[PDB]
Amino acid sequence: QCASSPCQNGGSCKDQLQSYICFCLPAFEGRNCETHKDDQLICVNENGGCEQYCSDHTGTKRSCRCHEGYSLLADGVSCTPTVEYPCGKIPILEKR
C-alpha cells in the first residue's frame, strides 16, 4: 500500500494492515502529510479564523471564543454583541 507514495512533502510511509501510516516531517500534518505549518488551522495563522479569541494547545483542533458581552455564532468563528454597548464598538458609527 506504501507503493503509491501517499505521504506528501517527503513523508515517511509504513505499511499497516491493508493500508499505511504517514510519519510526517516536523512542519507537516495530516493523514498524507498534505498540509504545511503556514496553511494549518492553528492559532498563529491569522488567529485561526476567529474574530476575537483563539486556542490550540489542547490537541485535536482549534476553538474560537469571544470577549465578555459577545457570543460565538453558528460558524464557530464570528462573534456578535449580546449587550447594548459592548466593549469597543463606536455606537455612533455602529448605527451609521
Binding site: 474574530e51 469597543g88 463606536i90
Partner: protein, 252 residues
Amino acid sequence: IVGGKVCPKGECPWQVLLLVNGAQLCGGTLINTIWVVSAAHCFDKIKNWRNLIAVLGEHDLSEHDGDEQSRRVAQVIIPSTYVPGTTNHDIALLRLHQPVVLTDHVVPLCLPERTFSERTLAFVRFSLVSGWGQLLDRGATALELMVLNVPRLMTQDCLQQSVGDSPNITEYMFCAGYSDGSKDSCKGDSGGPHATHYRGTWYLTGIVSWGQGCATVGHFGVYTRVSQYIEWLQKLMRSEPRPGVLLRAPFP
C-alpha cells in the same frame, strides 16, 4: 497630541479626562463602568485626593453639552514595581466611586486577553492615541479631543533614526509614532489609550507614557505595554474592594 485631528464627538467613547481641582491632569481609558486605566506618573505629585475627578463623554472642554459624566476617583492602584520619578511600569487602575452610565458617547475599550494581544494585536501596523494634552512640546493643551494614528515599532528600531541619560525602553513599554517631528502624543495625554482595531473591535494595547519632548525629529513616543498587565489588571477588578486611596498592588 501633536499633528493630530479632532476626534469627531462620539468617536472616542472610552476617552477619559482627569481633573485635579478643576485643572486638567491626564487622560485615561474606560475599561468597565467603575474602572479606568491611566498612568502611574499622573499621581506622582498629588496632595489632595478628594478633588480628583474623572470625566467621561467629554469632548469640548470649553462648553458643557450634557454628555459629560463625572465621578470622583475613589482609588488609584499602581504596580508595586513602579517608582515615582522613573518611567518603568507606568500604569494605574483607578476605581470610580459610582459607576458611569454606558451611553452612545460613553463606552469602555476592551481589555484584551493577553495572548491575543501579543500574537495578533501587536502586529497591527496602526493604532489610535488621543487626548487633550499639549498640542506642541511647550504649547497649549487642546480644547477638543485630538486623536492620532501611529504605526508601532519593534523596540530594536526605536532609536535607529536618532542625551545618553534619557529613559531606557524596557520590556514593559513599546514605541509608536513618527520620527520626522510631525506627529506624536505629548504632555497631558498620559494615560490616554493607544487603541488597536481588529475585525471590527477596538482593544487597549498601550498607554501614553512618555517621550523625548514631543515629535522630536529622530525620536518616537513611548507607551506602556498593556499586554504585560492583563492578569494584573483582571485580578484587581475581580477581587473585593480594598480600602485606601493609593494602593501599591503587588506585580506581578
